A paper describes a structure:
Elimination plasma half-life of ~20 h in dogs and ~70 h in man is achieved by a strong albumin binding, and by lowering the insulin receptor affinity 500-fold to slow down receptor mediated clearance. The crystal structures of these low-affinity insulin analogues were determined to assess the effect of the substitutions and addition of albumin binders. The crystal structures of OI338 and OI320 shows a conserved insulin structure with small differences compared to the human insulin backbone, with root mean square deviations of 0.37 Å (OI338, 44C(alpha), Cα atoms) and 0.56 Å (OI320, 41 Cα atoms).
Two amino acid substitutions (A14 Tyr→Glu and B25 Phe→His, named OI106) were sufficient to stabilize the insulin molecule, with an optional additional deletion of B27Thr (named OI189) conferring further stability. Only limited differences in proteolytic stability are observed when comparing human insulin with OI216, OI106 with OI338 or OI189 with OI320. The reduced insulin receptor affinity increases the intravenous (IV) half-life in dogs from 25 min (human insulin), to 24 h (OI338) and 17 h (OI320), respectively. The strong binding of these two representative insulin analogues, OI338 and OI320, to albumin ensures that the majority of the molecules in circulation are bound to albumin. Characterization of pharmacokinetic profiles (after oral dosing in GIPET®I) shows an absolute bioavailability (F) of 3.0% for OI338 (CV 100%, single dose, n = 40) and 3.9% (CV 78%, single dose, n = 63) for OI320, calculated relative to IV dosing. OI216 (human insulin desB30 back-bone) with an identical fatty acid side chain to OI338 and OI320 has much lower bioavailability, emphasising the importance of stabilisation of the insulin backbone. The pharmacokinetic profile for OI338 after oral dosing was characterised by a rapid absorption period, leading to a steep increase in plasma concentration and reaching an early Tmax which resembles the IV pharmacokinetic profile. A multiple dose study wherein OI338 was dosed daily orally to dogs for 14 days demonstrates that accumulation to a steady-state exposure occurs after 5 days. In people with type 2 diabetes, orally administered OI338 had an elimination plasma half-life of 70 h at pharmacokinetic steady state and a relative bio-efficacy of 1.7% compared to SC administered insulin glargine, with no additional risk of hypoglycaemia.
Author numbering:
A (entry chain B), C (entry chain B): 3 to 29
B (entry chain A), D (entry chain A): 1 to 21
Write the structure that this text describes.
């Protein structure tokens, strides 16, 4: 795998989660 | 958090999918 | 403005929300 | 939802920011 940061991490969540959507919470 | 698990560390699909709704 | 869909919408939320993060929930 | 307000329709920053945590 890769480190996934920032917009790449968001985009990965977008693709993987599909119609479910997701929560992105730094901190 | 997700940044810690996927950005600072490396995460797999299982962990990434934990953040789907 | 523009229509914002899919990865572009996610990316806009990423930029605007910053350290707060966001929830992306289709449906 | 956000898709309805920002993708099907057009949304401003105010509406987009409603989805920040």
């Amino acid at each position: 795998n890769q480190h996934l940061c920032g917009s790449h991490l968001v985009e990965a969540l977008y693709l993987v989660c599909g119609e479910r959507g997701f929560h992105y919470t730094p901190k | 958090g997700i940044v810690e698990q996927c950005c600072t560390s490396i995460c797999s699909l299982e962990q990434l999918e934990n953040y789907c709704n």
